[PDB]
Chain length 33, copies 2
């Protein structure tokens, strides 16, 4: 029939959010110029 | 007839010998490993 009347979006929050980060190394290159 | 008896080589020395050197820049590159 018709379109929706609303828009529902499930939301949630964890006990804690974060990020692990492993360093791969700097990148350096000499070029023309 | 036969082969040579000696071997002559012209030798010479300038008033001064040397070298001019222009620096082009260091070369650095990161690679696998």
């Amino acid at each position: 029939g018709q379109q929706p009347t609303r828009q529902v979006t499930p939301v949630s929050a964890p006990a804690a959010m974060g990020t692990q980060i492993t360093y791969r190394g700097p990148q350096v290159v000499t070029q023309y110029g």
